[PDB]
Structures are given as structure tokens and as C-alpha cells.
Paper text:
α-Helical coiled coils are ubiquitous protein domains, found in a wide range of structural and functional contexts. They consist of at least two α-helices, wound into superhelical bundles and held together by a mostly hydrophobic core. The seven positions in a heptad are labeled a – g, where positions a and d are oriented towards the core of the bundle and are thus mostly hydrophobic. We find that they indeed break the α-helices to form short β-strands, which associate into a triangular supersecondary structure we name the β-layer.
The middle three residues, KAD in A9, KDD in T99, form the β-layer in place of position d. We therefore thought that the central aspartate of the T9 insert might have been sufficiently unfavorable (T99) that an alternative, with the alanine of MAT at the center of the β-layer (T96), became observable, even though T99 allows the flanking coiled-coil segments to remain unperturbed and T96 requires their distortion.
Numbering used by the authors:
A (entry chain C): 6 to 66
B (entry chain B): 5 to 66
C (entry chain A): 6 to 67
The structure:
Amino acid sequence: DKVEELLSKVYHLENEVARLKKLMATKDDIANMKQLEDKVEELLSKVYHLENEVARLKKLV
Amino acid sequence: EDKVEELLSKVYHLENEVARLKKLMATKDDIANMKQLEDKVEELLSKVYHLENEVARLKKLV
Amino acid sequence: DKVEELLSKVYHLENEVARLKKLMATKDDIANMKQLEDKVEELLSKVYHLENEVARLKKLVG
């Protein structure tokens, strides 16, 4: 009776843990976001320089 | 006796699997983090459009 | 006795797994990250192009 209740609950948990393991691999690594943040950091910088260079040209012309 | 031994062993492996999941979870990106990066990509693309239009006029004027 | 112990550990696992599930729903998927990567691919191409144009505008004007 009580051992049965446990058997059923352990079975359910095993399935849940399996689904979580599956879902875990669909989630993105923090290392992927940091590397992307870096690239966006580079694009922040280059765009800043472009805005400066453009202003310069916009005044000469 | 037998079923209880089996249940001890299943619960032990689930505990170790669940413990592994909690450390895996910690190496994964939060959505709110991703949303702030999208906000910066939303900024940069607007600035790149604006610069494209400015450079279009400059090469025309020169 | 050993039934109590297993009843106790199961309960704790149920709560742990419920916590992991709602915590899983805060994490962003590789798909949306790949979409953001695509947009960063574009913007990096457009920046390089703009760099070329401006470098020419600079050396053409003065």
C-alpha cells in the first residue's frame, strides 16, 4: 500500500527528471551570452567612432 | 525487503541527478539578461540605420 | 521506518523538481540566442561596410 505509493511517485519523478534533463540541453550557456555581450561591446565601440567620424565629415562638407 | 531496497537505490540516483541538474541550471542564461542584450541590439541597429542614411548623403554631396 | 525515510526523501525531491521546473522557465532558449546571433551577424557586416565608406569619404574630401 505505502510501498506502492512510493513506487508510483518514484516513477513520476524519474520521468520529470528525464524531461528536465532534456529541457536543460535546450537552454543557452552563460559563456555564449558573455561572448555575444563582448561582440555587442565591440559594435558599441565601432558605432561610437563612426558617429564621431561622420560628424567631422558632415561639418567639412 | 526487495521493493524497499530497489526504492532506496532509485531515490539515491534521483538525488544525484537532481543535484547535477541544480549545478547545470546555474550555468544557463536568464531571460531578463537576454532581454537587456536585445535592448542594446535594438539600439545599435537604429544607430546603424541613422548612420547609413547620413553616409548616403555624404557620398552624394562629395 | 525505511518507508518513512523514503516518504521523506520523495517529498523533498518533489519540491526540488517543482522548483527546478519554474526555474527552467526563467532561462532563455538556444533558439532565441541563435536569433540574436543572426542580428549581430548583420550589424557587424553593416558596420564593416560603413567603415569602408567613411574611410573613402575621409580620403576623398581631405
